[PDB]
Symmetry: C6
Subunit: 30 residues, 6 copies
């Protein structure tokens, strides 16, 4: 249960990290 | 037990990493 | 079920993170 | 057993990673 | 099963992520 | 067995990543 819960939080953080790195990538093109 | 505790620490570090990257994205724009 | 699902989403997010970092790496050379 | 130890090492590396991104975030501001 | 496949893709992505961050580290000196 | 092995490779990769991010932080100062 808790393991499942932590993993969706981990999953959600990685989605956010994924989004931010795409934006960083896009910006570094200039 | 320990696996759960490690996973909670992992989850928390990742929120911190997510936040810093938000700030970094904002600074580079 | 849910753990596998989260792990499957974690895997997809890291593929995206990997690709974005390649793009950033490419940009810093170029 | 081995699974827990890997997770505790994973936890510590993510803490190091979080701190470094804090540092990076500060410099880019 | 599915968990194992997911952990290996993750393991593989992190190797790539590691390589890219190394290239980034290298470029940022000059 | 395979789960344990994957987690150990995950742990080692996170160590490399931690090392890289340290180098990146220093150059950005």
């Amino acid at each position: 249960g808790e393991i499942a819960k932590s993993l969706k939080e981990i999953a959600k953080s990685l989605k956010e990290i994924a989004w931010s790195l795409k934006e960083i990538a896009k910006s570094l093109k200039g």
